[PDB]
Structure 1
Amino acid sequence: TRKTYTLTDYLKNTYRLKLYSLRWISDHEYLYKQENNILVFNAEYGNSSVFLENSTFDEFGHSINDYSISPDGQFILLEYNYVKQWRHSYTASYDIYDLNKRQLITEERIPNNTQWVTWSPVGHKLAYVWNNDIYVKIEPNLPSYRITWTGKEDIIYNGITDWVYEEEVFSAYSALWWSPNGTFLAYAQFNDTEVPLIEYSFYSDESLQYPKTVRVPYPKAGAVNPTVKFFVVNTDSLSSVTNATSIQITAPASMLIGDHYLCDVTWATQERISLQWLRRIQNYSVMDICDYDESSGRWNCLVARQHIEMSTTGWVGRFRPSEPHFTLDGNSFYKIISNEEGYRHICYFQIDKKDCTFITKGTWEVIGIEALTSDYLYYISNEYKGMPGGRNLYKIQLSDYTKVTCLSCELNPERCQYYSVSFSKEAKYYQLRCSGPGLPLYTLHSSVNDKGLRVLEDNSALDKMLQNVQMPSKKLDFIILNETKFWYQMILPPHFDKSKKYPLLLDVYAGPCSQKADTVFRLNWATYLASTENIIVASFDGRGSGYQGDKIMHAINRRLGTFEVEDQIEAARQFSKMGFVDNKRIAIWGWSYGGYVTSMVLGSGSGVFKCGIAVAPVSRWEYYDSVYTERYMGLPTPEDNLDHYRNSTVMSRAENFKQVEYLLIHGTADDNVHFQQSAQISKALVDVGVDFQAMWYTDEDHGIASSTAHQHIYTHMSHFIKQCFSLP
Structure 2
Amino acid sequence: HHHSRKTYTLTDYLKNTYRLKLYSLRWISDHEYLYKNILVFNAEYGNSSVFLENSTFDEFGHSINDYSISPDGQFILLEYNYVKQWRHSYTASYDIYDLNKRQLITEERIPNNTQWVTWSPVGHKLAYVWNNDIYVKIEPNLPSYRITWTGKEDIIYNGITDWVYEEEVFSAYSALWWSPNGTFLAYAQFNDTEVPLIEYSFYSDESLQYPKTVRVPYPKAGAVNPTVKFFVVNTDSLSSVTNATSIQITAPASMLIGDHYLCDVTWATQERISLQWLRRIQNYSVMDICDYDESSGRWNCLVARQHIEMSTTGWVGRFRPSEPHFTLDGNSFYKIISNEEGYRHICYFQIDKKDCTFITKGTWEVIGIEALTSDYLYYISNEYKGMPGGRNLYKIQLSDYTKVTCLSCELNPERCQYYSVSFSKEAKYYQLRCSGPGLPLYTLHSSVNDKGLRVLEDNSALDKMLQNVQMPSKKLDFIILNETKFWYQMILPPHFDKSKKYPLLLDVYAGPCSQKADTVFRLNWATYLASTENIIVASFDGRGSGYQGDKIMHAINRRLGTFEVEDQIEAARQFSKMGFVDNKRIAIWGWSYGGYVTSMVLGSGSGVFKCGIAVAPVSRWEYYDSVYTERYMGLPTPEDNLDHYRNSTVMSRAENFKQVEYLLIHGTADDNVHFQQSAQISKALVDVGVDFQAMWYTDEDHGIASSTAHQHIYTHMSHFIKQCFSLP
CA distance in 2, matches of 1:54, 1:483: 60
Residue 556 of structure 2 corresponds to 556
SS for the counterpart of 2:453 is strand
How big is the shift at 1:47?
1.2
SS for the counterpart of 2:629 is helix
SS for the counterpart of 1:190 is strand
How big is the shift at 1:393?
0.1
CA contact (8 A) 1:598 1:614 kept: yes
CA distance in 1, matches of 2:726, 2:548: 38
CA distance in 1, matches of 2:73, 2:464: 39
How big is the shift at 1:477?
0.4
How big is the shift at 1:280?
0.3
CA distance in 2, matches of 1:601, 1:241: 65
How big is the shift at 1:214?
0.1
SS for the counterpart of 1:151 is coil
CA contact (8 A) 1:380 1:392 kept: yes
Instruction: Note the aligned Cα RMSD (angstroms).
Output: 0.4
CA distance in 2, matches of 1:168, 1:352: 31
CA shift digits 1:294-331 (9 cap, x unpaired): 10000000110000000000000000000000000000
How big is the shift at 1:565?
0.2
**1:50 maps onto 2:53 in alignment:** no
How big is the shift at 1:658?
0.3
How big is the shift at 1:49?
1.1
Residue 513 of structure 2 corresponds to 513
SS for the counterpart of 1:682 is helix
CA distance in 2, matches of 1:272, 1:442: 36
Aligned positions of 1:274-423 closer than 5 A: 274-423=274-423
CA contact (8 A) 1:577 1:583 kept: no
SS for the counterpart of 1:329 is coil
How big is the shift at 1:2?
2.5
SS for the counterpart of 2:703 is coil
CA distance in 2, matches of 1:493, 1:307: 52
Which 10-residue stretch deviates more, 530-539 or 574-583? Answer: 574-583
CA distance in 2, matches of 1:308, 1:301: 14
How big is the shift at 1:577?
1.4
CA distance in 1, matches of 2:636, 2:195: 17
CA distance in 2, matches of 1:329, 1:51: 35
How big is the shift at 1:554?
0.2
CA distance in 2, matches of 1:463, 1:102: 42
How big is the shift at 1:544?
0.1
How big is the shift at 1:52?
0.3
How big is the shift at 1:46?
1.3
CA shift digits 1:116-170 (9 cap, x unpaired): 0000000000000000000000000000000000000000000000000000000
How big is the shift at 1:42?
0.7
CA distance in 2, matches of 1:101, 1:306: 49
CA distance in 1, matches of 2:693, 2:35: 47
CA shift digits 1:675-724 (9 cap, x unpaired): 00000000000000000000000000000000000000000000000000
How big is the shift at 1:644?
0.2
CA distance in 2, matches of 1:220, 1:563: 24
Identity in percent: 100
CA distance in 2, matches of 1:3, 1:414: 25
CA distance in 1, matches of 2:118, 2:514: 32
CA distance in 1, matches of 2:138, 2:103: 18
CA distance in 1, matches of 2:548, 2:288: 29
How big is the shift at 1:645?
0.2
CA distance in 2, matches of 1:327, 1:397: 14
CA contact (8 A) 1:133 1:159 kept: yes
How big is the shift at 1:471?
0.4
CA distance in 2, matches of 1:368, 1:177: 21
Aligned positions of 1:65-84 closer than 5 A: 65-84=65-84
Unaligned runs of 5+ in 1: none
How big is the shift at 1:339?
0.5
Under a length normalisation based on structure 1, what TM-score does the superposition of the two structures give? 0.99
CA contact (8 A) 1:5 1:532 kept: yes
CA distance in 2, matches of 1:283, 1:630: 11
SS for the counterpart of 1:51 is strand
CA distance in 1, matches of 2:52, 2:515: 41
**1:621 maps onto 2:628 in alignment:** no
Aligned positions of 1:434-445 closer than 5 A: 434-445=434-445
CA shift digits 1:238-292 (9 cap, x unpaired): 0001000000000000000000000000000000000000000000000000000
SS for the counterpart of 1:363 is coil
CA distance in 1, matches of 2:22, 2:209: 44
CA shift digits 1:430-484 (9 cap, x unpaired): 0000000000000000011101111000001100011111100000000110000
CA distance in 2, matches of 1:461, 1:341: 46
CA contact (8 A) 1:378 1:396 kept: yes
Residue 466 of structure 1 corresponds to 466
CA shift digits 1:529-588 (9 cap, x unpaired): 000000000000000000000000000000000000000000001111121110110000
CA shift digits 1:217-248 (9 cap, x unpaired): 00000000000000000000000010000000
CA distance in 2, matches of 1:232, 1:67: 27
SS for the counterpart of 1:55 is coil
SS for the counterpart of 1:462 is helix
SS for the counterpart of 2:400 is coil
CA distance in 2, matches of 1:13, 1:506: 24
Residue 7 of structure 1 corresponds to 10
SS for the counterpart of 1:54 is coil
Residue 31 of structure 1 corresponds to 34
SS for the counterpart of 1:361 is coil
Which 10-residue stretch deviates more, 570-579 or 275-284? Answer: 570-579
CA distance in 2, matches of 1:579, 1:253: 60
CA contact (8 A) 1:114 1:130 kept: yes
CA distance in 2, matches of 1:73, 1:333: 31
CA distance in 2, matches of 1:138, 1:148: 16
CA distance in 2, matches of 1:500, 1:159: 59
CA contact (8 A) 1:491 1:537 kept: yes
CA contact (8 A) 1:396 1:403 kept: yes
CA distance in 2, matches of 1:594, 1:201: 25
How big is the shift at 1:101?
0.5
CA distance in 2, matches of 1:414, 1:540: 23
CA contact (8 A) 1:619 1:678 kept: yes
**1:106 maps onto 2:106 in alignment:** yes
Residue 592 of structure 2 corresponds to 592
CA distance in 1, matches of 2:352, 2:41: 42
How big is the shift at 1:69?
0.3
SS for the counterpart of 1:433 is strand
SS for the counterpart of 1:401 is strand
CA shift digits 1:637-658 (9 cap, x unpaired): 0000000000000000000000
SS for the counterpart of 2:237 is coil
CA contact (8 A) 1:90 1:115 kept: yes
CA distance in 2, matches of 1:680, 1:337: 40
CA shift digits 1:173-210 (9 cap, x unpaired): 00000000000000000000000000000000000000
SS for the counterpart of 1:445 is strand
Residue 260 of structure 2 corresponds to 260
CA distance in 2, matches of 1:603, 1:515: 24
SS for the counterpart of 2:575 is helix
CA distance in 1, matches of 2:708, 2:414: 38
Which 10-residue stretch deviates more, 45-54 or 89-98? Answer: 45-54
CA distance in 2, matches of 1:572, 1:499: 18
CA distance in 1, matches of 2:191, 2:170: 16
How many corresponding residue pairs? Answer: 725
SS for the counterpart of 2:108 is coil
SS for the counterpart of 1:305 is coil
CA distance in 2, matches of 1:130, 1:657: 50
SS for the counterpart of 2:711 is helix
CA distance in 1, matches of 2:511, 2:89: 24
How big is the shift at 1:507?
0.3
CA contact (8 A) 1:196 1:219 kept: yes
CA shift digits 1:73-113 (9 cap, x unpaired): 10000000000000000000000000001111000010000
CA contact (8 A) 1:392 1:407 kept: yes
CA distance in 1, matches of 2:298, 2:5: 71
How big is the shift at 1:389?
0.1
CA distance in 1, matches of 2:465, 2:424: 33
CA distance in 2, matches of 1:22, 1:605: 51
CA distance in 2, matches of 1:554, 1:609: 27
